[PDB]
Amino acid sequence: PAPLTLIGLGPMGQAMGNALLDRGHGLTVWNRTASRADALVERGAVRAPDVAAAVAANELVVLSLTDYDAMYALLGPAADALAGKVVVNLSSDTPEKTRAGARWIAEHGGTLIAGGVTVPPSGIGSPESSAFYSGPSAAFERHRETLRTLTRTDYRGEDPGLAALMYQIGMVMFWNAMLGYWQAVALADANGLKAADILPHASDTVASLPGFLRFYADRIDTGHHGGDVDRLAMGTASVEHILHTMADSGVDTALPEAVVAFFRRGMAAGYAENSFSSMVELLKK
């Protein structure tokens, strides 16, 4: 297995580092908080003197940070060390910031591959694990086998933003679904029910979503927002009852208020008789 440098050791990056060591990869790490690399070092990782040394150690540098601004902060004072290096950046950020980071890396003679890892850290190294990748194909094919140690690879194309776009598209579904669950757990707690008590209905509800995804996919793509199976007017009534249910039980209402606010906008747009899918048209450019 090929050697590489890894910079960034939060839950995800520690899991990536342990996975890389597990397959046989000579791993050089570097972190501002040196304590966070101690365990990896005892597991065999080479602690790098500084960030310039870490960049210089290997051709392949994997980054796992908060955003692309964190790549400018750490690599900037080592920017000349980047000539000939391949920077696989797995940090979340917008497609536009990823494209700028990609241009900035090419500035210093490096090559950036953008990655969006679509599994929690426990998924690093598992057959289920996946990640979108985009950027220069030859640079990706060269180091793909290293990347397959972390996740299955899903190369989206030459645009460095594609991996970022698809990672964000998945994340906004994740966060919103989990926020609905948080609200349900709060409402249940407020009424003397643990998460364990609503878990069967909650799981049932989320397990029906793929069929709903598929139904509304064909309709939205054909422009079919007709009201034959649901009516925005009823959807609005329903999100209002959730808002007032939550208010009655003492649960914070900022999130349901925004939801009600959005449906009433579709009502204002004339969509009462249409499907609540009609609100994608409100969200569109």
Next chain:
Amino acid sequence: RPAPLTLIGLGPMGQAMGNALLDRGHGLTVWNRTASRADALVERGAVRAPDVAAAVAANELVVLSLTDYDAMYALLGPAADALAGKVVVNLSSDTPEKTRAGARWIAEHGGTLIAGGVTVPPSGIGSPESSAFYSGPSAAFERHRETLRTLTRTDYRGEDPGLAALMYQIGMVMFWNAMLGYWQAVALADANGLKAADILPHASDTVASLPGFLRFYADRIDTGHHGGDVDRLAMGTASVEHILHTMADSGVDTALPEAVVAFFRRGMAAGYAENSFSSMVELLKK
């Protein structure tokens, strides 16, 4: 032998329910604000009651499928006297408090109100896969549980009438939020030249992971474990900020991601950066 019953409320759900009862040979009495909505059912063999008073008088079991409980008061006002001794199964969505007040109302007219929460769209009525939460007087429910089975499986929760409304709302707040997350992903995709079919695999995969995330976080929330060993609120706040800016960068409306971002930022203000994003459940709680 299938019991006879009255069905008031002939909107899509009511139409589906009437058709299911008729398919099983139930003696169906129907009534609606608009009499045209009973046309198909009357042709199939439903008796159209001439008025709500006769509809309520036709049987002990009165099934309602209306917008809310306010609607019940407005249409069952003329039939107020016939409600004596009747079991009114309201399958109308509403708040637990409004459901309880409607129960108090029906009791003030000598009747008994059972609260119903149908967990499925009208297409699911009649399916064994479908269920509905029920709450209210156990005796009255057990007397008509067989009739209700024609519509969906029964999940009786208890005597509290608002109980069935609560569990119904609990599932609904999860449905709308997940589908609003999908709507945002379709708009972002469309803004970048991708159709809903293009992102459907990753969309389905994301919602396919949810049961595991639910079980994982159910144990931890219940045990008070908001430790940041698998996720950090700080990383979470950054992610929703990236979503917000990605959608702004794409020209997509951002009221929805603005709310999410404002929510994560309150957990950041509460000092939760190193905790799991599950910690913000404490911010929502009573």
